[model samples]
Target: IVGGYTCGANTVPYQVSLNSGYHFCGGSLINSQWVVSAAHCYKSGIQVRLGEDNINVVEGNEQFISASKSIVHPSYNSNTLNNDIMLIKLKSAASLNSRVASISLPTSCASAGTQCLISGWGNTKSSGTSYPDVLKCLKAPILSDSSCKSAYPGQITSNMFCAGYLEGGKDSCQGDSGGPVVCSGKLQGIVSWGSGCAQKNKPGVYTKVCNYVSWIKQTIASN
Candidate 1:
């Protein structure tokens, strides 16, 4: 489960809802036709909803696009949860507007302690029975490698990092996977996984996007 509240519509233009009959994951629009998400989010019948604030109602600005192809990282590890990034190519490009736009990618890695924003439609509590209809946003501070390692000694890796509070109360929950972790106005991470939503000393883990820039460029070019 994720912990957050209703976010303002169009505040995070790049945020996307990944659905397969129902909403399951969150994603970010990196380009007109390309969306970045977690590899674990890969599944049949996946579709994307952009410029959407309320999931239950259809807003005029909302764009529902079918995925032409989904490219998951070749080295994704389900057990260890490493290299969890993936890309979804839209069948048709999204129409850019005030309510819909692409986010900038990081030019360099984010340093520890940098504050970032995370948004999703995940649950408000760990045991919550339903997901929020409106998008939710939260602020989290990036944890240093040392601090992250101390929390999950053997699980933290070079391709992954941690963010959120050491104290329980806030985080990206299960349905929030594949969402954006924007820092300094650039995409820094992709929501991956964690022990449990907002657990103490177990901040949410994410796929470090800076570590895969080369591969992202290469894959986009080839595909």
Candidate 2:
């Protein structure tokens, strides 16, 4: 439950589970045929599950679709984890029902201290091995680039941002990568990487979605 409380099934309709043979990462349905996620979560045999709340139980609203293509940012840097974003084209378009929908992308960058929400099915604790059956959600405040840089010195590039509590005990951990960080009902960030879950002063880092809006439009248009 990723250090948060359980959310209603329909609360986060845009959330999707990216499975590489198993549930490995989270994603957001940006459109009927496209999903946005973290590039680091890419792997072979990728499939996407939509309208899912419980991972263990398959409900009537769930739709499983195979990925047709994965478009990772050309300039994605693995070593420094910069530009950690990607798009997954579904083999079939998702049927948008009451339980399934798409999220809007941010037109402008997020400001510091903006309260946001993050949802995922990851470990409750950083050292925990087991994940939750139901999806979880948490409210976080966006940290300024300078504040984030202070926490992650020599890291936290412009392409990335930070969100979470400064005190600790609330964050996205392992198995929560590629999840959405929604601010003002728009996708502002993508769960990329972090130091070690919800560590003191080490908030979760995310791929800045606003920075790549142009690239996303061009990629979708050309591809």
Candidate 3:
């Protein structure tokens, strides 16, 4: 039901099974003790995988940070897919390494169309199948507010940003939800709902990072 344009992490895809495998969404490290992900990924019995290369077998030096607790935005509604953001507090602060390090949030000066990158372990093609281990990446153009509204009509909101190829090529697909749409420098946009992967007239939509800065700060602070 959910699709977009991006790639995921390097582990064996779907190896980090959780919630009966129905809630396997990608997330990013925010700090030694925290990970930022989409709210829709939350569910009871959910578990997360980190620093693995294969789904069937754990790989060399791969970090597997299990969750102590997950905090989804209370306003989240899976039915309507609103307020799609969440944070995972690891059981303990993860030991950082070159292969696994936390992604930084945007500073006060960040703006839309800020040259973000997206990745996932979803299908290489738009549909028909999904990738099991390989990870892919693509450059996404940060859409301006007026341009996003003009391109997406009523779907563009202050809480969301848009990206994807206008000419149509690669894109995020099913099983790619809750992944980061990150600017090259450090800022991240939590890319979520969209029509399909790389469809013309339908750019990928993301949860705006700046708009939720206060929420993020408060949540991290409280924890």
Clashing pairs in 1: 1-173, 2-173
Model 1 CA deviation exceeding 4 Å by range: 1-3
Q: What TM-score, over all chains together, does every model reach?
A: 0.97, 0.97, 0.83
Q: Number of clashing residue pairs in every model?
A: 2, 0, 14
Per-residue lDDT, model 3, residue 134, is 42
lDDT of 1 by residue, 2-90 (tens): 65666798888999999898898999998899999999999988899999899879988899999999999989998898999999999
What C-alpha lDDT does candidate 2 achieve relative to the native structure?
0.89
Per-residue error for 18 in candidate 2, Å, reads 0.7
lDDT of 2 at 17: 95
In candidate 1, how many Å is residue 97 off?
A: 1.0
Regions more than 4 Å wrong, model 3: 1-23, 109-113
- The clash number for model 3 is 14
Order the candidates by TM-score, highest first: 2, 1, 3
Model 2 is weakest, by summed lDDT over 10 consecutive residues, at 122-131
Q: Model 2, 136-179: lDDT tens per residue?
A: 99999999888899999999789989899778778988777898
How do all the candidates rank in terms of lDDT, highest first? 1, 2, 3
